[PDB]
Amino acid sequence: ISEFAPVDCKGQCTTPCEPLTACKEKCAESCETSADKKTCRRNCKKADCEPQDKVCDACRMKCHKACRAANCASECPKHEHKSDTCRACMKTNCK
């Protein structure tokens, strides 16, 4: 692996979404063919998947930046304000 190609984030969120996913999963099981799986799970997501889920977002939130600072760099300076050349860079770079 070398420093090239676009980077991801969704996939790069297993550690921060390790306990979360497990939460959804474990629930998914307990909510097998249950009336309104979604709802069920959703509620199960509140059981004790509130903080876990958050940790996930964080990842998606950080990665978002990490990527920018990573892939991009010139298209996005230190302090910006929704730069076009940035959103365009991250758009392509940050697939």
Domain count, the chain: 1
77 Cβ contact partners less than 8 Å away, ≥ 6 residues apart: 83
The CATH number linked to 56 is 1.10.246.100
**Domain housing 87:** 1-95
CA distance linking residue 45 with residue 56, whole number of Å: 13
Contact 83, 75 (CB under 8 A): yes
CA 90 remoteness from chain centre: 15
